[PDB]
Design a protein around this nucleic acid. Sequence first.
DNA 1: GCTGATGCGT
DNA 2: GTCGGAC
DNA 3: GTCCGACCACGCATCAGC
Length: 609
Amino acid sequence: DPSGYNPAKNNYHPVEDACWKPGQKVPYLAVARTFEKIEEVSARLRMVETLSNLLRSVVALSPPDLLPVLYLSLNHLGPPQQGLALGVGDGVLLKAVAQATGRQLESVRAEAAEKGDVGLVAENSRPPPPLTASGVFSKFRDIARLTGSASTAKKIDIIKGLFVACRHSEARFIARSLSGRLRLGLAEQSVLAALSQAVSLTPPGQEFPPAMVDAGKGKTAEARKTWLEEQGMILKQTFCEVPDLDRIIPVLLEHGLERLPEHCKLSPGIPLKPMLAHPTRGISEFTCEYKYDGQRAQIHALEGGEVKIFSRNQADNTGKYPDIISRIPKIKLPSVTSFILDTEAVAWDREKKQIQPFQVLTTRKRKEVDASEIQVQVCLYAFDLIYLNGESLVREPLSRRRQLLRENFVETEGEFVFATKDIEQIAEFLEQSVKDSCLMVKTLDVDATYEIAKRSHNWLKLKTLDLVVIGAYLGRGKRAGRYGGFLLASYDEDSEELQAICKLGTGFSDEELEEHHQSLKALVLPSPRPYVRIDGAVIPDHWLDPSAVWEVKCADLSLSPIYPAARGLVDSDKGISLRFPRFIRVREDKQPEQATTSAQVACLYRKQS
DNA sequence: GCTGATGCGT
DNA sequence: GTCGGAC
DNA sequence: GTCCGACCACGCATCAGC
């Protein structure tokens, strides 16, 4: 009976300890029961095993259901290049739960807001055939394909049909999946670890009578551990080169995991997971390049001239840059017939020959008609090469890939322009980075391969205000019960009014948050003060008496179309907000009068470009 | 047809 | 993107 | 160090309600 399925049992038998007959479809409660045990523990090694147990039974009883439960565990709808967006938010979900039972949208809303989880409302609310993992996944994609008018009403009917067919704790995880907050403590890295362990303990491609169930029986603890970790590296590396489960799982079920690297290989047109960077504390904590504050572009080109542009998250951005598809042969030499460059596109004013900030680049359309309607032109600063003429260059060192790019890449004016241990020299380039409106520290030969599975962020990144609190927001998930965010403001000396500037939801410890919770508890106001102005920011759940001064760090100052801070001092209709805000400390010495004035905020914004 | 609310992605 | 927690 | 889920501002794109 799936009502008592336990994938966290000692000596889990993939065939006996299951809850569905072989050949039959996997019930969603088996998935819901597995999620309930994953969220019940905290150690990832226990989460990976519990999830792996279900994957064993799936890989032995219902093989074709493996891709759905994997995508259902990832809370994804398919490959990232497909772009299947669910298009369901809080309002659609709560309205679907209201029509599912009880009605009273306000009661459904206010309960979930304090709980921080809509799954508890849909579950605790007081005939249909049982739910299937494939069927639930098929309806998730059916919801994502619904577009046009009356699409929301069509989505609600599917969600209503799912909730009425839910049993036990199925309404919890369907509501969390549709809300995009599965909150399971398990994600992409651990899913792969559970998949690699499952196909190794219970190998795929066996007869109806399961021949092998626990292939680690004839090994010792050090052997099984080493054997499982070596096999996980084969899967994780291949996924870093082909992050597409619709392509790995079919191969993984026929050729096995040991032969997976031979079939699923790096190929143009298939986006790969890119190289990330870690935060370097400074020169105290090797090539150095500019960190162009723009958007990453993975330019692919297959055999035949077909060009495809992908983002950092393997999203298809080919249609967003028609100006690049019609300008690729201007940089590749005659020997180039297949290549994958790693470049960071940045907005460029061809007239003034200057780089434009990140805000100007975000004003481009996602589906551009042609270059005749494109106003914001982009410039490409290439920095790495992964593919070249049918040859994968992942295992090659960084110094070798830079030579091939600097040879075959032909720099063109305005578009294609490819981007020592002397401390004073490095400080000049770091200071000239801000000067040229941009540092990146990367290795050359030692540990300088494009292998994301060895280290996800093997690169290094070379890169204050005092505001008052005026409001607070109720937290969600791990912040339920306490305060999740805070509304901050500056003081306008000319008009004597607090002007909201940004929200604050990071930088404080759990102990520091409870200190903020207790210190600002008695300052709860029923109505906002008359000398407080927020413009169009989110109305705080608890209006607080202006008395607490916090020091906040941020990356940049940006013209805010919603915050009233310093409106009229830099733009006639836009205020100023903080980019990447974060709590630093509490200024118990200061009062709201000794705070960063809006006149000072405008001076900070003029200092930066 | 427009607008605000909002979903999604960066 | 930044951040802290748990392991 | 790794992995995860809290959280941020801001842009386009979408669509119900008008």
